[PDB]
């Protein structure tokens, strides 16, 4: 037939080694642009003034960093939320000095990361699958949207976003605690229970299945050869695993149903990380964690400190030190 | 930067020694039947 029809058949072809798709038409160029710029920036980018006070910060390997300390530095605080592509700077040298590459990377990334989520629905539709794997991937994606855009929006500058580095991320966690007390916010607490229980339930489900394999191999070879790809048989006894775990706790604290169980394994961490993503997105608008400073007080009026008042002391130490020259006034309201 | 001098040979052997261990075991497996 025509070439456009033949092109549409190739984009949606289920026989490609890597599925393209209509979401993939946008995802591939945006990702390729983001990694190529990230690799080059991480190696040889000149220093960047992130805080806009003519105080550049070295972030690339060729400028005295290692893998632990290297980072792509956020754009200057003099730009704020302004769009800053390459063609808005009088040259590349000006573009690199004001943290230009940071905007180009996170924009092309979040675009491709979103199309990556839709690409999961697209291939599910062409293979006869149910579509809700993309919904589970929305939890880590919304998390990336929070620390890269939602928080710079609420604070009014991309210089306050999470840097693209290992030590840069550590700088983002410490300052976020001093200005929002994220540890005392319930949504981060729900996020910890999602990742702690996520690893707990991962180790548990992995152990109980590897506790009741049908014996189909000798002692000389691996147990994995007892399963063969595409076989109709289930290679482990489910009611045998239910009989063990149901006696450790009690019978009704164990899942007898395999579909109800894997749903619980998918549900728990996804909605848990959904909250810790919503925790970052809400504290972006300065609705911070619980404040119990000087909340207990004696019959006279002396402040009886608690463990919350000690947390306030460590927070004061971070707050008075972060961005040691960026402030001229007694309050840090952004 | 003034880094450690033995760090180069530390990383080089840290990569090489366990690498060739897995490579020897793999090539001798495909040469079987």
């Amino acid at each position: 037939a025509n070439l456009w029809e033949r092109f549409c058949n190739w984009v949606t072809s289920t026989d490609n080694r890597l599925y393209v798709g209509w979401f993939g038409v946008i995802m591939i160029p945006t990702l390729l642009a983001a990694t190529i710029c990230f690799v080059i920036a991480f190696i040889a980018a000149p220093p960047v003034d992130i805080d806009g006070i003519r105080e550049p910060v070295s972030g690339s390997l060729l400028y005295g960093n290692n893998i632990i300390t290297g980072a792509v530095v956020p754009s200057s605080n003099a730009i704020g939320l302004h769009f800053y592509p390459i063609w808005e700077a009088a040259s590349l040298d000006e573009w690199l000095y004001n943290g230009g590459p940071y905007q180009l990377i996170i924009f092309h990334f979040l675009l491709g990361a979103s199309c990556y989520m839709g690409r999961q629905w697209e291939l599910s539709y062409r293979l006869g699958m149910r579509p809700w794997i993309c919904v589970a991937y929305s939890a880590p994606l919304a998390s990336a949207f929070a620390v890269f855009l939602i928080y710079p929006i609420g604070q009014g500058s991309f210089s306050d976003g999470m840097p693209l580095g290992i030590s840069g991320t550590f700088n983002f966690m410490i300052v976020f605690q001093a200005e929002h007390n994220i540890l005392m916010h319930p949504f981060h607490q729900l996020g910890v229970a999602g990742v702690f229980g996520g690893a707990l339930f991962c180790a548990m489900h992995g152990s109980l299945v590897t506790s009741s394999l049908i014996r189909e191999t000798t002692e000389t070879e691996s147990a994995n050869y007892g399963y063969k790809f595409g076989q109709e048989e289930e290679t482990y006894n489910i009611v045998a695993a239910h009989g063990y775990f149901g006696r450790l706790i009690f019978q009704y604290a164990s899942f007898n149903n395999s579909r109800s169980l894997h749903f619980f394994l998918a549900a728990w961490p996804v909605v848990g990380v959904w909250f810790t993503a919503l925790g970052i997105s809400t504290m972006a608008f300065n609705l911070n964690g619980f404040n119990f400073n000087h909340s207990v007080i004696d019959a006279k009026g002396n402040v009886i400190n608690t463990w919350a008042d000690i947390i306030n002391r460590a927070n004061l130490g971070m707050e008075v030190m972060h961005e040691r020259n960026a402030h001229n006034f007694p309050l840090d309201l952004a | 930067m003034e880094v450690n001098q033995l760090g180069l040979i530390a990383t080089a052997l840290f990569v090489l020694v366990p690498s060739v261990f897995l490579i020897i075991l793999y090539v001798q497996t495909e040469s079987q039947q």
Binding site: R17, L18, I43, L61, L62, N66, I67, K228, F229, G230, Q231 | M1, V3, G7, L8, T11, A12, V15
Partner: peptide, 30 residues
């Protein structure tokens, strides 16, 4: 020597991706 050592390891991990995908062991059904 450090910068060359970091990028060399990074290049091997990327080269490892190309073989683990396009030169994997085909999974076959039976």
């Amino acid at each position: 020597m450090e910068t060359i050592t970091y990028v060399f390891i990074f290049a091997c991990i990327i080269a490892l991706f190309f073989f683990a995908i396009f030169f994997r062991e085909p999974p076959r059904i039976t």
